[PDB]
Amino acid sequence: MAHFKEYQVIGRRLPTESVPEPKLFRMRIFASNEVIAKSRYWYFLQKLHKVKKASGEIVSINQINEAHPTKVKNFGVWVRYDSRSGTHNMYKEIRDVSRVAAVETLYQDMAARHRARFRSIHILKVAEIEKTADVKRQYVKQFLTKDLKFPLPHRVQKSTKTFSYKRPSTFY
Amino acid sequence: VEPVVVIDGKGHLVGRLASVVAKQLLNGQKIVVVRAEELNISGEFFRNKLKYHDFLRKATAFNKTRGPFHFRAPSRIFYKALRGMVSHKTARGKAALERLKVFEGIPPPYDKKKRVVVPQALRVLRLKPGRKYTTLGKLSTSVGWKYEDVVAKLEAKRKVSSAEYYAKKRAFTKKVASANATAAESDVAKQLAALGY
Amino acid sequence: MKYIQTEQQIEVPEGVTVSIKSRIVKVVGPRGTLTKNLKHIDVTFTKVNNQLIKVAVHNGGRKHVAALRTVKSLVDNMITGVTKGYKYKMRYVYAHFPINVNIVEKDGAKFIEVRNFLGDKKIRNVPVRDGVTIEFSTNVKDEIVLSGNSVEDVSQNAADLQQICRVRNKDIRKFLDGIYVSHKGFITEDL
Amino acid sequence: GLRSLTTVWAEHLSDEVKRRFYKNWYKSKKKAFTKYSAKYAQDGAGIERELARIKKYASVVRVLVHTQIRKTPLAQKKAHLAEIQLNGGSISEKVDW
Amino acid sequence: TDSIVKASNWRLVEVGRVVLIKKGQSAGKLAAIVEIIDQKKVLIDGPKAGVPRQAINLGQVVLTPLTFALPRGARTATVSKKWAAAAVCEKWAASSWAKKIAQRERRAALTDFERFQVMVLRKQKRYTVKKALAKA
RNA sequence: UUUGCUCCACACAAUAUAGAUGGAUACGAAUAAGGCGUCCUUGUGGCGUCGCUGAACCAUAGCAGGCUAGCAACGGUGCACUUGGCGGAAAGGCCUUGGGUGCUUGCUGGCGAAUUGCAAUGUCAUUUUGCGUGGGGAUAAAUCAUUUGUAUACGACUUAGA
RNA sequence: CAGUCAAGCGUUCAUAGCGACAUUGCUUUUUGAUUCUUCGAUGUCGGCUCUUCCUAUCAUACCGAAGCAGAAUUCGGUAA
RNA sequence: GAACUGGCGAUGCGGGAUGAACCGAACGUAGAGUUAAGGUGCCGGAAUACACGCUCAUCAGACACCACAAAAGGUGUUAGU
């Protein structure tokens, strides 16, 4: 959809004569902007409990960011993607620096490999990964071994002009 | 920048090469190309062939003569696809055909000056490690070109003559480099290395 | 999934030596030589310690990774064929018409003669490749041996004999008459 | 294709070949190869100039020759000329023959 | 007689190898590998230049055959701690790589008066080299 | 058929332009590799180096580029020749020798300009031709009228004839 | 015309060759459907004639299968 | 053959190669800047832009209206549950 950011939505339907101020909920949304996250709230909310954007409301809508935006981390994910047949449950484990960061790449991944749309992906829960060995994904295991050192063969360049008066080599 | 731009067809990509060439000639550039037989295609021997086969079966029903023209010359092969991306019908595209010139190998006047290349048009650069392709020299031969070893005999005499002159040139630059090093580290050498040269 | 690092290890039998530049090989030794072009796959090789050289791939697909294993396999068969060689056997099968084999040579072409292949009134021949030399097998009834450096020229010349005897318009299961390959080993004994 | 380089000749000819060139022969001056026989006055430095020029480059040999229609029962008198390829050994030794 | 299989020298991707940024907020600064993410993206960090510890693509930065000792996780402190503990600054401007840069860098900062000086000092430079390729 | 005609040194009018205005600046193969300098037993040999764009390199200061003195070297470039070698793919150009010769901005001088009055390309290119100059060289053919059958609706095809 | 699931038939085995109850397609050489087009005109049918194109290949050249022993046939493939 | 709203008839203009209708938009004659629908190697105007990957096809694919395509399989490869 766009570049991602993560927000924090808070609501309580609407207070009443009998019992005002209901339970009071919260959620962790991923939206490039504020209003985007307001729909995602009501999204799963009018799917689990009884409410709407007419019988209830939202108090706060602030953004939540990753504390250490310098360190690359591992991340596990809970997805409920709806195909041209139906809904299934898949488990991913991609290593990215920030949380909202791995979400943008896995969303791009859903279309380049899974062919599913923005309005076709379901995020259940994403518990960050702390321990190696508990690794069950193999594309992950290649970057988790000691002494990750490898040569970079074949080096192409970007031409600024229109010509070349030679025969440039491709070393790296 | 120069009166004419010389083009080396060896190691480039068929259609992408003509595209950039096209633009330059329509801007005001007279151009001559060489060794068009060495233009590299992609895919299998089998594929690229049959495409020319079905192109070979499409001709004016009632007049095979005043209709489609097929070619065995790797040079007018480049002429074909490149003219088909301009209007050879107006005086506009008519003058572009007259500026352009293509050759089967590197003829007499055109190998007494050097030819150039391009990265965004290079076969080697737009080819992923471990890919297939076909060359025009070999397929030009399978389509009906009776001039392979006739011209492979010409390139022999040629590559010998060009290397004999670079023998004298490689040794004459060994003279230029040993004269510039003995006159180096002087007063004008120090002052110039400071100005940026 | 572009396999990051996949690499195999290879042993050299002391006395043999191989020269290499680009993707071009050379196996010099006890019997002969074997030049080879590999500039159609695109891979790397590195000499580590005299009698040991490797092969590697960095970020290569499963078909390119199945090719790293496929060439370490090739490197192996070129070294043993130079020191031991490649010796195969083929027996002629018949039960009625005598299988006659000769050694012909017109102008110096070296072929093999097919006489009486099932009452054959036409003369069939078998072209001989370069490098490998044949020898008629005795002590045994209806056989012969091939001997050289590479498995290609020896067993493709053996596959020559194979399909040259085609039972056209007949029952293969019943009219089982022709030349088949019996033995597949080295020229040296014990191996 | 097959490109023709040098065209060589003889000194004296026949009127059959000289009239092969005229349309109006009953009114001609007969200036047929008059200056070509001037290449036969000089020792012949130019004759071998083109002859050995061919022994160096030219791949094949094809020679021109005219007919003997005077001994023939035909009143045309005009003898035709055509090229006949030489199938011998070495192109240099072919020019010699 | 032995084997001999070329050289096959390459720059290996690792924690401690430095690269040159061509585009971005820097577009001509230096930064070394702090951690590796995958195939095209890595983590840089170069304090002796003024650039941050940022996630970046390999298509926007180049390489160098310069590698010095570095811990797997070392933040800003240990980054230039081993930078100076290796002597990579003098080892960097010790090549024609960076001499090439300052050469055309000073050409884009040349006045026609100082560009005029290059022309004239070369009038006398080429004169002595012509009396050199005439007697030797 | 009035002195006609072809190449050159040229005398002027022209006629247009698919587009002048410092140099189109010449190994080969290879790119999961390579060029270059270098040594030896000249091997698919060892050692060092470069690339990340030709933003390279060479040339370039003067009335659109002048008159001319002196130093230093014996050199460079352009002009017209001379010696020899090479070049067949669409050679007709490239390589080199000897003299004559101008510049010599490689270093230091004497003088010239204006008003063209704050901008107006303010021309220093070349395709081709017509007509007068004088120095070499050459004395052309085809058509029809006529006849022929190897040709034909017709021209054409094809023979011949001072 | 071509399949596909495959109870079975096939002495014994579903798939040698076929294949019911079923289900997926293609075509405009069948007749239908339509009035879009033309009733101030496009000369109906067939035939004789002459040319070309398609392949859903009947035959030949090269080939695999069999309940192909010999022999022949039936199915299939590249190909007009 | 009917119900809704809208079009054309009676409508050019950019676009859909082009087409009565689909999208955008409706119109005096110019001049500038800004966007619509759609695109941007060349035709042909405009980045052979950057990004994350998928595919090698002995008849590839390559954007609504719309220009046709299905069952059913595959140890081709991929992420997988």
d(CA B166, CA B168): 5
Distance in Å, alpha carbon of E14 to nearest chain A alpha carbon: 5
Q: Are E58 and E40 in contact (CB under 8 A)?
A: yes
Place of tokens 């690269």: E19
The topology under which CATH files domain B1-147 is Ribosomal Protein L13p; Chain: A; (3.90.1180)
* Total tally of structural domains belonging to chain D: 1
d(CA A90, CA A81): 8
Residue span of the structural domain in which E32 resides: 12-94
Listed by start position, the domains of chain B span 1-147, 148-197
Place of tokens 């083929």: C90
Pick out residues 35-74 of chain B having their CB under 7 A from any atom of nucleic acid strand H.
Answer: 43-44, 46-47, 50
Inter-CA distances, A7 with A63, A79, A99, B111, Å: 4, 19, 12, 67
**B180-192 residues labelled b (16+ CB within 10 A) or e (exposed):** eeebeeeebeeeb
Nearest CB neighbour to C44, from listed E1, E8, E39: E8
- Chain breaks of chain A after residues with C–N above 2.5 Å: none
The set of strand G positions with any atom below 7 Å of a protein CB reads 52, 63-66, 68-72
> What region, left, alpha or beta, does residue E39 occupy, with left being phi > 0 and alpha being psi -120 to 50 degrees?
alpha
Pick out residues 149-168 of chain C having their CB under 7 A from any atom of nucleic acid strand G.
Answer: 166, 168
d(CA A9, CA A62): 7
The contacts of residue C89 (CB under 8 Å, 6+ apart) are C137, C143, C144, C145, C181, C182, C183, C184
Place of tokens 């003569």: B65
Inter-CA distances, E129 with A48, B169, B178, B186, D1, Å: 89, 18, 10, 13, 51
The CB-based long-range contact list for C140-146 (8 Å cut-off, 24+ gap) reads C140/C91, C142/C91, C142/C92, C142/C93, C142/C94, C142/C99, C143/C89, C143/C90, C143/C91, C143/C92, C143/C182, C144/C89, C144/C90, C144/C101, C145/C87, C145/C88, C145/C89, C146/C86, C146/C87, C146/C88, C146/C90
DSSP symbols for B89-104: TSHHHHHHHTTEEE-S
Task: Please provide the CATH number assigned to the domain covering A70-146.
Answer: 3.10.20.10
Tokens of C111: 């072929």
For residue C114, what are the β-bridge partners?
C101, C124
Q: Are E12 and A151 in contact (CB under 8 A)?
A: yes
Nearest CB neighbour to E13, from listed A72, A96, A149: A149
Looking at residue A23, the DSSP 8-state letter turns out to be S
Inter-CA distances, A22 with A17, A19, A48, A51, Å: 12, 7, 15, 11
d(CA C163, CA C155): 13
d(CA C51, CA C68): 20
The amino acid that residue C123 corresponds to is I
Listed by start position, the domains of chain A span 3-69, 70-146
Q: Determine the Cα angle at B171 with ends A170 and E96, to 5°.
A: 40
Distance in Å, alpha carbon of B58 to nearest chain A alpha carbon: 37
Q: Are A25 and A12 in contact (CB under 8 A)?
A: yes
HEC assignment per residue over C14-71: CCCEECEECCEECEECCCCCCCEECCCCCCEEEECCCCEEEEEECCECHHHHHHHHHH
d(CA E35, CA A114): 29
User: Which residues on chain A are in Cβ contact (under 8 Å) with B117?
Assistant: 163-167
> Treating both helix axes as pointing N-terminal to C-terminal, what angle do B136-143 and B74-83 enclose, rounded to 10 degrees?
100
Closest among B5, B21, B39 to B140, alpha carbons compared: B39
d(CA C54, CA C47): 7
Taking the alpha carbons at both ends of chain B, their separation in whole angstroms is 24
Q: Are D78 and D18 in contact (CB under 8 A)?
A: no
Q: Among B173, B188, B190, B191, pick the best mutation site for testing chain E contact (most E Cβ within 10 A).
A: B188
Order of all β-strands in the sheet with C6-11? C6-11, C52-57, C44-47
User: Which residues on chain E are in Cβ contact (under 8 Å) with A151?
Assistant: 10-13
Q: Are C153 and C160 in contact (CB under 8 A)?
A: no
Architecture of the domain whose range is A3-69:
Roll (3.10)
Q: What's the CATH number where D48 sits?
A: 3.30.1430.10
Q: Are B21 and B82 in contact (CB under 8 A)?
A: yes
d(CA B86, CA C113): 63
For residue C76, what are the β-bridge partners?
none
Residue span of the structural domain in which D34 resides: 1-97
The reply to whether A109 Cβ lies less than 7 angstroms from strand H is yes
Inter-CA distances, C91 with A28, C99, C179, Å: 78, 10, 6
Q: Report all structural domains of chain C as residue ranges with CATH numbers, in order of start.
A: 1-85 (3.90.930.12), 86-191 (3.90.930.12)
The highest-level CATH class for domain B148-197 is: mainly alpha
Pick out residues 14-73 of chain D having their CB under 7 A from any atom of nucleic acid strand F.
Answer: 19, 21-31, 34-35, 53, 57
Distance in Å, alpha carbon of A81 to nearest chain E alpha carbon: 25
Same fold flag, A3-69 and A70-146: yes
Please name the helix (run of DSSP H) or strand (run of DSSP E) that holds residue B81, with its range, or none.
Answer: helix B74-83
Q: HSE on the CB side for B138, CA within 13 Å? A: 10
According to DSSP, the β-strands at B30-34 and B4-8 are parallel
Q: Determine the Cα angle at C41 with ends C38 and C44, to 5°.
A: 75
Closest among A63, A54, A58 to A8, alpha carbons compared: A63
Q: What's the CATH number where E70 sits?
A: 2.30.30.30
A146 CA to centre of own chain: 28
Closest among B144, B104, B146 to D1, alpha carbons compared: B146
According to DSSP, the β-strands at B30-34 and B100-102 are parallel
